[PDB]
Design an enzyme around this catalytic site. Structure first.
Site, short mmCIF file in Angstrom:
data_model
loop_
_atom_site.label_atom_id
_atom_site.label_comp_id
_atom_site.label_asym_id
_atom_site.label_seq_id
_atom_site.Cartn_x
_atom_site.Cartn_y
_atom_site.Cartn_z
N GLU A 295 -6.08 29.25 38.87
CA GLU A 295 -5.32 28.36 39.75
C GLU A 295 -3.82 28.67 39.77
O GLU A 295 -3.23 29.10 38.77
CB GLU A 295 -5.55 26.89 39.40
CG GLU A 295 -5.14 26.49 37.98
CD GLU A 295 -5.33 24.98 37.73
OE1 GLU A 295 -6.27 24.36 38.35
OE2 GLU A 295 -4.56 24.41 36.89
N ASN B 15 -8.88 21.54 44.75
CA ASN B 15 -10.23 21.04 44.64
C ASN B 15 -10.19 19.55 44.46
O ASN B 15 -9.54 19.05 43.53
CB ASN B 15 -10.92 21.72 43.45
CG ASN B 15 -12.42 21.40 43.34
OD1 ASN B 15 -12.95 20.57 44.05
ND2 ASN B 15 -13.08 22.02 42.39
N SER C 154 -10.23 28.22 41.26
CA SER C 154 -10.43 26.79 41.40
C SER C 154 -11.04 26.44 42.77
O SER C 154 -10.55 26.92 43.80
CB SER C 154 -9.06 26.09 41.30
OG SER C 154 -9.24 24.71 41.55
N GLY C 155 -12.08 25.60 42.79
CA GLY C 155 -12.67 25.14 44.08
C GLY C 155 -13.76 26.06 44.61
O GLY C 155 -14.33 25.81 45.65
N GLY D 144 -11.16 27.08 36.66
CA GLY D 144 -11.09 28.34 37.38
C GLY D 144 -9.62 28.72 37.60
O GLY D 144 -8.71 27.88 37.45
N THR E 185 -18.75 24.60 39.19
CA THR E 185 -19.36 23.39 38.68
C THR E 185 -20.62 23.03 39.47
O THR E 185 -21.61 22.60 38.89
CB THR E 185 -18.35 22.28 38.70
OG1 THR E 185 -17.34 22.64 37.76
CG2 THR E 185 -18.98 20.88 38.32
N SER F 182 -11.81 18.81 40.86
CA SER F 182 -11.46 19.88 39.94
C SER F 182 -11.80 19.53 38.48
O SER F 182 -11.44 18.45 38.02
CB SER F 182 -9.98 20.28 40.11
OG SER F 182 -9.63 21.31 39.18
N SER F 183 -12.56 20.42 37.80
CA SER F 183 -12.81 20.35 36.35
C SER F 183 -11.50 20.64 35.61
O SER F 183 -10.91 21.76 35.74
CB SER F 183 -13.80 21.45 35.93
OG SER F 183 -14.93 21.44 36.72
N1 ADP Z 1 -23.45 25.08 46.75
C1 ADP Z 1 -22.66 24.08 47.28
N2 ADP Z 1 -23.16 23.17 48.15
C2 ADP Z 1 -22.43 22.19 48.69
N3 ADP Z 1 -21.13 21.99 48.37
C3 ADP Z 1 -20.52 22.80 47.48
C4 ADP Z 1 -21.25 23.92 46.86
N4 ADP Z 1 -20.39 24.56 46.02
C5 ADP Z 1 -19.22 23.91 46.13
N5 ADP Z 1 -19.29 22.87 46.99
C6 ADP Z 1 -18.18 21.95 47.37
O1 ADP Z 1 -16.96 22.47 46.83
C7 ADP Z 1 -16.36 21.54 45.96
C8 ADP Z 1 -15.74 22.37 44.83
O2 ADP Z 1 -16.74 23.08 44.11
P1 ADP Z 1 -16.75 23.02 42.50
O3 ADP Z 1 -18.07 23.53 42.11
O4 ADP Z 1 -16.26 21.65 42.03
O5 ADP Z 1 -15.57 24.08 42.20
P2 ADP Z 1 -15.11 24.76 40.80
O6 ADP Z 1 -15.38 26.22 40.94
O7 ADP Z 1 -13.61 24.53 40.78
O8 ADP Z 1 -15.85 24.11 39.67
C9 ADP Z 1 -17.52 20.62 45.58
O9 ADP Z 1 -17.06 19.33 45.11
C10 ADP Z 1 -18.31 20.52 46.84
O10 ADP Z 1 -17.53 19.79 47.81
O1 VO4 Z 2 -11.15 23.43 40.44
V1 VO4 Z 2 -12.34 24.03 39.24
O2 VO4 Z 2 -12.18 25.65 38.81
O3 VO4 Z 2 -13.46 22.97 38.37
O4 VO4 Z 2 -11.00 23.78 37.73
MG MG Z 3 -15.35 22.86 38.13
#
Ligand code: ADP
Ligand code: VO4
Ligand code: MG
Ligand code: BL7
Ligand code: MG
Length: 703
Positions: A450, A224, A179-180, A448, A184, A227-228
């Site tokens: 968690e 996160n 997660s985080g 992801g 996404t 978080s999705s």
């Molecule tokens: N390539 C990136 N560029 C800028 N910020 C990022 C990037 N990847 C992640 N982040 C930051 O991390 C946060 C969590 O990433 P996210 O993709 O939502 O995580 P997850 O793997 O849980 O889907 C985002 O909302 C943003 O703040």
């Molecule tokens: O915090 V993420 O892995 O979108 O559920």
């Molecule tokens: Mg996500």
């Protein structure tokens, strides 16, 4: 060519900066170095030490503070520093944990978040914006081979797209991470890139789908801020000519329990805060809305705002996205009425009456909910506290107590919100369904891995999904790869890469002997079962019998599962009710008579409203979960996969703070080093006998 121009944004942001004359001197040095642990209790904390002498079997090195010795067989040699910053780590001379981490460190320190680890891409979350995703960046990557350009999510997106065209084969991009980690955000860049390079309204609608899905399906957790809380597989569809012709969103089970409960510091779904922050003064009057502190479903966690996020400004974006996809103004109104009515339902306070049954003395929230939903409040009241059931064939009005009334109210809420979510996805999909596809590239973005203070049924399923995805990586990189060599008799000795999630998988979802989920389902139709008889049964089957299961000594209500990513202790409270997912039929009868056109579809459209039957009972959530998972895995088998391993730097959601132990745990359980080793030691390419080499039964094989 910005590629060859050292002053371009491309060089500035995607290329290792020119070293200077001091660094040159260091680079040509005859000295040799070793990565060692200053503290042997702490295996992931490394310093660099000069190798001062050696024997046949050992090195002696300086430490940062004495001299120590280590067997050459145990030594993590530092790469020549000319390797520092390398774009593909399969080129490293020494492949070891501190050297791989060090290379990622050097790149990260310069905001280079993408690095190849052989055949797959590693992406380390920056937790800040980096200007590498502009249209100008996209134009650069367009049609470039992977070795012609710096590591980038755009590059692997292009590789899939060319493979799709060249091989006439559907592709997938599987983005893993706890997660985080950045799954996404990378998913969104893949989509952006494909829509640009293969594009021609439709492309805008594909992009605008996402703020709608996030407003309703993402929430701040302790891991996160965005978080999705549902997973998705996004099929980007192309015609025979390679142009985008549609898209389809497969969404997976939503964490509905978050609507009615959030742990401390967490938030409910973003949409709730967006509505209350961004609604007009008389949008608010008409929906009987006030501030989030006024609502039980928003005022428990202690957190109503997210750092750096304007819920009002996001609301504008969600509404604009709804406009673009094509939700009518009435549809949108109805959406917000459903959201408001859920907040009102959560404000209903049951109390004890004269007997054991609950009463409603204050009907303010009830009336406000019924008004915005367009349902009859007397009917709703009766359906909450006195629902009718069959007893044999007799029709008997129950009279539920406070706790059962409150639970039923929560059940109605979660069904409203989960059905609304499905309807949003259905509506979006109909709009994106404009052509039969010839081909697709599917992007997988699951919830992801968690771990929380309290892990429940939802966390088990999320974590199992992540376990299954890691197994898919293991199968593809190591197992199927060696099965091919050995089907082709190419002089390969089999290597045990030591990565097998099978035991954990079997524990959770085994058939014979039954795993955790099978046992949950058995208990779910056992008329007197409780959460206590459930955990007793899990303990009886697995305690001291299954190596991935632990019955803890400190608790009678938790069991431990050893996942690829770490042990997780699961709290058994509410698992039978969560799995059965009941809703009183009288509540459904109430809402089927709604005067609202959206509400009425949520309750009358069997594709949204109806639940499947397993013989005498409705399909359990575990069974629904398994069907979704099996359907996903079946789709992936029809595709050629590309893996992106998202790596979180720390557990604080901060930039410029790579934490050794955090990162190294991920590189380990992800199988990153193993994946680099197979790339080096194996034979990635093979053609049937076609008109550092191996002659197989039917194929030439090359390094
Ligand atoms: N390539 C990136 N560029 C800028 N910020 C990022 C990037 N990847 C992640 N982040 C930051 O991390 C946060 C969590 O990433 P996210 O993709 O939502 O995580 P997850 O793997 O849980 O889907 C985002 O909302 C943003 O703040
Ligand atoms: O915090 V993420 O892995 O979108 O559920
Ligand atoms: Mg996500
Ligand atoms: O990634 C997922 C996922 C992906 C594939 C199949 C099922 C899935 N289930 C998921 N979740 C779930 C929620 C409540 C109960 C059970 C599961 C949450 C994430 C999820 O949609
Ligand atoms: Mg505990």
């Amino acid at each position: 060519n910005p590629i060859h121009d050292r002053t371009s944004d491309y060089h500035k942001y995607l290329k290792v900066k020119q070293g200077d004359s001091d660094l040159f001197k260091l680079t040509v040095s005859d000295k040799r170095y070793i990565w060692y642990n200053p503290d042997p209790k702490e295996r992931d904390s490394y310093e660099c030490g000069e190798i001062v002498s050696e024997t046949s079997d050992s090195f002696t090195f300086k430490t940062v503070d004495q001299d120590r010795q280590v067997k050459k067989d145990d030594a993590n040699q530092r790469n020549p520093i000319k390797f520092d910053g390398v774009e593909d780590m399969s080129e490293l001379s020494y492949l070891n944990e501190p050297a791989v981490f060090h290379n990622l460190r050097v790149r990260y320190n310069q905001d280079l978040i993408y690095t190849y680890s052989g055949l797959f891409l590693v992406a380390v979350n920056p937790f800040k914006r980096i200007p590498i995703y502009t249209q100008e960046m996209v134009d650069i990557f367009k049609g470039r081979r992977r070795n012609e350009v710096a590591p980038h999510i755009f590059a692997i997106s292009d590789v899939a797209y060319r493979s799709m065209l060249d091989d006439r084969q559907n592709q997938s991009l599987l983005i893993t991470g706890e997660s985080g980690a950045g799954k996404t955000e990378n998913t969104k860049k893949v989509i952006q890139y494909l829509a640009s390079v293969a594009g021609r309204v439709l492309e805008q609608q594909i992009l605008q789908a996402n703020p709608i899905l996030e407003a309703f399906g993402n929430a701040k957790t302790t891991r996160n801020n965005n978080s999705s809380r549902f997973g998705k597989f996004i099929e980007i569809q192309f015609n025979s000519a390679g142009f985008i012709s549609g898209a389809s969103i497969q969404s997976y089970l939503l964490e509905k329990s978050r609507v009615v409960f959030q742990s401390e510091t967490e938030r409910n779904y973003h949409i709730f805060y967006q509505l209350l922050a961004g609604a007009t003064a008389e949008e608010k009057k008409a929906l009987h809305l006030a501030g989030p502190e006024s609502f039980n479903y928003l005022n428990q966690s202690g957190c109503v705002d997210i750092k750096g996020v304007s819920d009002s400004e996001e609301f504008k974006i969600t509404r604009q996205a709804m406009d673009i996809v094509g939700f009518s103004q009435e549809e949108q109104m109805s959406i917000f009425k459903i959201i408001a009515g859920i907040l009102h339902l959560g404000n209903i306070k049951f109390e004890k009456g004269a007997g054991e049954g609950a009463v409603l003395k204050d009907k303010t929230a009830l009336n406000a909910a019924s008004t915005v939903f367009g349902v009859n409040p007397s009917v709703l009241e009766k359906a909450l506290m006195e629902p009718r059931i069959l007893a044999g064939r007799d029709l008997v009005a129950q009279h539920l107590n406070v706790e059962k009334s409150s639970s039923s109210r929560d059940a109605l809420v979660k069904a409203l919100y989960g059905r609304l979510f499905l309807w949003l996805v259905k509506k979006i999909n109909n709009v994106l369904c404009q052509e039969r596809k010839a081909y697709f590239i599917g992007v997988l973005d699951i919830s992801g891995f968690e771990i929380f203070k309290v892990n429940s049924f939802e966390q088990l399923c999320i974590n199992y999904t992540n376990e299954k995805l890691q197994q898919f990586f293991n199968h593809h990189m190591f197992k199927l790869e060696q099965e091919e060599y050995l089907k082709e008799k190419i002089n390969w000795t089999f290597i045990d890469f030591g990565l097998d999630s099978q035991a954990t998988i079997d524990l959770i979802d085994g058939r014979q002997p039954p795993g955790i989920l099978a046992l949950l389902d058995e208990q779910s139709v056992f008329p007197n079962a409780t959460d206590n008889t459930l955990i007793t049964k899990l303990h009886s089957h697995f305690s001291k019998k299954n190596a991935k299961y632990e019955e803890p000594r400190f608790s009678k209500t938790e069991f431990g599962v050893t996942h690829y990513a770490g042990q997780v202790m699961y709290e058994i409270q509410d698992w039978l009710e969560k799995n059965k997912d009941p809703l009183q039929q009288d509540l459904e009868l109430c809402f089927k008579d709604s005067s609202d056109n959206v509400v009425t579809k949520l309750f009358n459209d069997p594709n949204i409203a109806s639940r499947a039957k397993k013989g005498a009972n409705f399909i359990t959530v575990a069974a629904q979960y398994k069907e979704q998972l099996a359907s996903l895995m079946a789709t992936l088998e029809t595709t050629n996969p590309h893996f992106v391993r998202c790596i979180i730097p720390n557990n604080k959601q901060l930039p410029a703070k790579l934490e050794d132990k955090v990162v190294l745990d991920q590189l380990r359980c992800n199988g990153v080093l193993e994946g680099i080793r197979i790339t080096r030691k194996g034979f990635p390419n093979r053609i049937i006998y076609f008109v550092q080499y191996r002659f197989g039964i039917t194929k030439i094989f090359f390094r």
